[PDB]
């Protein structure tokens, strides 16, 4: 069985023992997290519904908390002598689904 | 082992020597010698002397048998050109590049 959790303005399909990379959370490396919003559990014998299966809090652990790799945002306008360059690294946290 | 021999600032354009170096690259040694002997091209004797030099270094400089060697490498690099002129019509004058070349040959016994 799997589950569907809503974390960062997105849904995610999680199974036990899977490593996920979600948006930044305020939990610290080594701790454990608990996802409340769960839209669909099961996939072996029990199905459920929504907007929220009242109960069924997935339990994970905070594996790492880091930053993606830099993407350079460069754009220009032809013949107008206007250009611009930025650089970006989006932070993330990596978790591991312990138990659904 | 490999033996090698070079001939520097041969006075022939490099892309005229690369035409006949491509016929003997890979062949045996006594076959490449006859190929260089029986070809019409003007750069045949020069490559033949460089090949015989690399075949002679093997007998004496590093002892090995000359009936087993194969031409492992043979190439021609550029060298310093010469800048001459040719006076054409109406006062003009056009350039002339006298190219040179560096012919290298490496013979190996496959070991």
């Amino acid at each position: 069985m799997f589950a569907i959790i809503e974390t960062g303005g997105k849904q995610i399909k999680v199974e036990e023992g899977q490593e996920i990379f979600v948006e930044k959370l305020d939990v610290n490396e080594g701790d454990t997290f608990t996802f409340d919003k769960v839209l669909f559990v099961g996939g072996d014998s029990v199905k459920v519904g929504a907007p929220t299966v009242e109960g069924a809090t997935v339990t994970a652990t905070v594996n790492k908390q880091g930053r993606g790799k830099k993407i350079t945002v460069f754009t220009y306008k032809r013949r107008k002598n206007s250009k611009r360059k930025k650089g970006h690294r989006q932070p993330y946290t990596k978790l591991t689904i312990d138990k659904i | 082992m490999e033996a090698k021999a070079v001939a520097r600032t041969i006075r022939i354009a490099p892309r005229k020597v690369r035409l006949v170096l491509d016929l003997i690259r890979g062949k045996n040694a006594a076959e490449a010698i006859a190929i260089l002997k029986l070809t019409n091209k003007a750069s045949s004797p020069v490559i033949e002397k460089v090949l015989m030099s690399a075949l002679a270094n093997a007998e004496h400089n590093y002892d090995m048998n000359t009936d087993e060697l194969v031409v492992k490498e043979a190439y021609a690099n550029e060298g310093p050109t010469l800048k001459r002129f040719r006076p054409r019509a109406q006062g003009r004058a056009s350039a002339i590049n006298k190219r040179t070349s560096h012919i290298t040959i490496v013979v190996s016994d496959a070991k």
Partner: protein, 50 residues
């Protein structure tokens, strides 16, 4: 006319595909032992014997 535009070293290297020479078309003389051109005389010490 003049070339409208420069030639890549891809187009040049393609067009020099068939620009080459061939192996002299030679046999081995059965008197000199050495190599020779077929239908020509043995340039080494020897003759034709055709």
């Amino acid at each position: 006319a003049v070339p409208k535009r420069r030639t890549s070293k891809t187009r040049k290297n393609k067009r020099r595909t068939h620009f080459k020479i061939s192996v002299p078309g030679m046999t081995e003389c059965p008197n000199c032992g050495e190599y020779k051109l077929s239908h020509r005389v043995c340039k080494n010490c020897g003759s034709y014997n055709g």
